[PDB]
Amino acid sequence: SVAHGLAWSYYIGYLRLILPELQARIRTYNQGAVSQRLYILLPLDCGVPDNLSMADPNIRFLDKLPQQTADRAGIKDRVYSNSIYELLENGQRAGTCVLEYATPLQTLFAMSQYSQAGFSREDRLEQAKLFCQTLEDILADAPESQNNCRLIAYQEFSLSQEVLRHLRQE
Amino acid sequence: SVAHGLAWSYYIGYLRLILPELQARIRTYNQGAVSQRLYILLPLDCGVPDNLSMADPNIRFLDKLPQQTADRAGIKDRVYSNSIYELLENGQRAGTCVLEYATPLQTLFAMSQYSQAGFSREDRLEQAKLFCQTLEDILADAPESQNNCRLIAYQEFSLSQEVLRHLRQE
Ligand SMILES: Nc1nc(=O)c2ncn([C@@H]3O[C@@H]4COP(=O)(O)O[C@H]5[C@@H](O)[C@H](n6cnc7c(N)ncnc76)O[C@@H]5COP(=O)(O)O[C@@H]3[C@@H]4O)c2[nH]1
């Protein structure tokens, strides 16, 4: 399956490389009490906007974490950057975390729109479900995941309330 | 198929975003004489080193192109960087280009090594072939590709000679 490959791609070329160095990057930034995990937004509708504040105005960009750099596949100093968001609830800052959407969900979205990609617009939801299921299975038994990462899967609503529910569990 | 999804992912979340802005970045750097296309290395063995000079000492890093920046899926100022290499032939600089390996080939490589990933070590070569075939089909009919991109697919040997052969065609 394409979803299965994308979930494996997402772990191999991203999660596996950034999750081990994430603690040191948040500690560096702290030294506005940002949480220690990467919160990954997984909309099952594959609706992935580039600006989180457009999805919910109660999610507001605060700052970027110090950039991660690595030589990768002929690219000298490839950059991995993560953004810090503050979550508002009735005019109050209720949480602060490293938040982003899972980017492969934009591939599933674009593949369902292009005729030569071979999967209908109808198939988007089950591909998104298989992607979340594969990613949860990978992170269940992955070493780089040590209470380091949280997946927020959802079907449409308040996005900031959805994130806060997961944040309040810790 | 996994390869098919990875080729679509490679075009949607990368080629489609960097190919239209590539000319303007090479022109800026040229203000030597770097070629106008992105040369994409596609080893069918999925052998993707992080340093190009280790694959062939006749391929030597020169400089980075001005970074490309975009807000993407909740990541403010996500960075896309490309490296400029010089190709040597008997102690002479024979070519200068923006060169890199296709990164999904590291996913196919890692998936053939992990038991929960679904395809064996045996399947690596045909997945790499399907990936190249899908990517060639995508770039045949893609608008962003306007004598902008060159795929260098190969089975093992001199890598710099393989790149120079493609460079000398233009
Ligand atoms: N050569 C190269 N240079 C790049 O800068 C780059 N950026 C993406 N890609 C490849 O394009 C395709 C589409 O990208 P997508 O965002 O959907 O997936 C990405 C994305 O979900 C995540 N990821 C990797 N690097 C970053 C990053 N810097 N910021 C956010 N997410 C990232 O992990 C997936 C796999 O990454 P790569 O394994 O490097 O391969 C991707 C993929 O094949 C790149 N390929």
Side-chain angles (χ1 to χ4, degrees), chain A residues 1-22 24-26 28-35 37-53 55-75 77-112 114-115 117-120 122-132 134-135 137-140 142-145 148-149 151-164 166-168, chain B residues 1-22 24-26 28-35 37-53 55-75 77-112 114-115 117-120 122-132 134-135 137-140 142-145 148-149 151-164 166-168:
Chain A
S1 192
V2 343
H4 178 84
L6 293 187
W8 273 91
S9 165
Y10 190 61
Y11 165 73
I12 292 149
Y14 186 59
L15 296 182
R16 187 170 83 151
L17 325 163
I18 80 147
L19 292 181
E21 287 308 315
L22 185 66
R25 289 166 64 220
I26 294 161
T28 296
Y29 182 87
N30 280 328
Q31 287 157 8
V34 190
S35 188
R37 300 166 128 213
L38 175 59
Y39 291 80
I40 305 160
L41 292 168
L42 300 165
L44 299 175
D45 65 356
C46 299
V48 179
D50 295 320
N51 160 230
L52 257 151
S53 304
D56 191 332
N58 283 325
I59 306 172
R60 185 185 68 217
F61 173 81
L62 171 61
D63 221 4
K64 304 175 212 181
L65 219 39
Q67 289 178 353
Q68 189 184 337
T69 253
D71 294 340
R72 215 179 134 208
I75 305 204
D77 300 327
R78 186 175 160 171
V79 179
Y80 301 92
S81 330
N82 304 84
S83 291
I84 309 153
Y85 286 83
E86 50 219 305
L87 307 126
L88 310 170
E89 183 193 70
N90 317 124
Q92 302 296 319
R93 307 198 278 99
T96 302
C97 67
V98 188
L99 193 56
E100 60 198 58
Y101 284 105
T103 8
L105 294 174
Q106 275 190 335
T107 288
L108 291 170
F109 192 90
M111 286 179 86
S112 61
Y114 289 98
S115 50
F119 83 72
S120 180
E122 244 173 45
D123 313 336
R124 232 191 256 136
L125 176 61
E126 73 165 31
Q127 286 301 304
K129 290 159 172 181
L130 181 59
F131 174 86
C132 297
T134 311
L135 195 55
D137 295 355
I138 303 162
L139 302 178
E144 309 83 2
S145 182
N148 242 347
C149 176
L151 309 174
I152 304 163
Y154 57 96
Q155 244 183 115
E156 288 189 74
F157 187 85
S158 186
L159 188 50
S160 53
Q161 275 306 112
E162 190 67 24
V163 176
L164 285 169
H166 283 81
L167 262 176
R168 283 163 178 164
Chain B
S1 190
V2 163
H4 178 84
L6 292 188
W8 273 91
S9 165
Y10 190 61
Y11 165 73
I12 292 150
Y14 186 59
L15 296 182
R16 187 170 83 151
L17 324 164
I18 78 140
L19 295 181
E21 287 308 315
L22 185 66
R25 289 166 64 220
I26 291 161
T28 298
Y29 182 86
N30 282 336
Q31 284 163 0
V34 192
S35 189
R37 302 163 124 212
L38 175 59
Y39 291 80
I40 305 160
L41 292 167
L42 300 164
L44 299 175
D45 65 356
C46 299
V48 179
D50 295 321
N51 164 227
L52 230 330
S53 304
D56 191 331
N58 283 325
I59 306 172
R60 185 185 67 217
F61 173 81
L62 171 61
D63 221 4
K64 305 174 209 182
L65 219 39
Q67 288 178 353
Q68 189 184 337
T69 253
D71 295 339
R72 215 178 134 208
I75 306 205
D77 300 327
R78 186 175 160 171
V79 179
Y80 301 92
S81 330
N82 304 84
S83 291
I84 309 153
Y85 286 83
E86 52 223 306
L87 307 126
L88 310 170
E89 183 193 70
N90 317 125
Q92 302 296 319
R93 307 198 277 99
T96 302
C97 68
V98 188
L99 193 56
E100 61 198 57
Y101 284 105
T103 8
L105 295 174
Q106 275 191 335
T107 289
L108 291 170
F109 193 90
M111 287 176 83
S112 64
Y114 289 98
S115 49
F119 73 78
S120 55
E122 245 174 46
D123 310 339
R124 235 192 252 134
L125 176 60
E126 73 164 29
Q127 286 301 305
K129 290 160 172 181
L130 181 59
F131 174 86
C132 297
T134 311
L135 195 55
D137 295 356
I138 303 162
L139 302 178
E144 308 83 2
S145 182
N148 236 342
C149 178
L151 309 175
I152 304 164
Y154 57 96
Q155 244 183 115
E156 288 189 74
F157 187 85
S158 185
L159 187 50
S160 53
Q161 275 306 112
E162 189 72 26
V163 176
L164 285 169
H166 283 81
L167 262 176
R168 283 163 178 164

